[PDB]
Design a binder for this molecule. Sequence first.
Ligand SMILES: [Ca+2]
Length: 245
Amino acid sequence: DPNIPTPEGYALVWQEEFDGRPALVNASNWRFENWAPGTVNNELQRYVAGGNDTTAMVKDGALHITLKKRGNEVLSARMNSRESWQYGYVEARIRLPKGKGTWPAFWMMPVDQREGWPACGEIDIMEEVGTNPNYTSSSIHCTAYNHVKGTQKTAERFTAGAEGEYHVYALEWTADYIRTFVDGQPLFYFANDGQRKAATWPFDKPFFVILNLAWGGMWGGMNGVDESALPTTMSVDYVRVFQRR
Ligand SMILES: [Ca+2]
């Protein structure tokens, strides 16, 4: 479609356009997590499937993931794409939520996780925390480069208005390098060192896309959380996946 900004040399292979009343997310594209609080990263939110206690819906052509307090729990949602891809251009148009304690994320995990994490590898396309507003980052995780060893590869940049406005976060992932962009402007770069060692390059297998909004946790809650900011919403206009022709 000529209406889709397409990187040079690429063709579209997958698109979630999230096509004025709310509706349910397209279940053929996404699998939800049903996770109690504290399941990973000591996070405070509960990830639910969805009364008005729905945390993920589609409205006005965009996915909306909303953090909301219900009872004595903060509810949210975490989605995995049912399709996966090896290499490609992975782009989403995302509007970040607002509040000390938010942790929106647009990232990727491999289909094959038998090696365990972080050996299996992890690509963070967009990460941000409401305690440090409008600082979005990109990272990769692996045996050699991860936070336990203090060696995680990451890059960070201030993007004015990222909370409250849509911006285009993208990943360019080939056999030679991983690179991310913010509004077409390069941000993170990580090269394949060519050693053919899984410790430094586990990125030669299919990965799927994850969208989630956490509350608190080891990163989001490192300075505390502010429940007065609830409710707050992360909005995704689209997720598109391109691959080389
Ligand atoms: Ca849309």
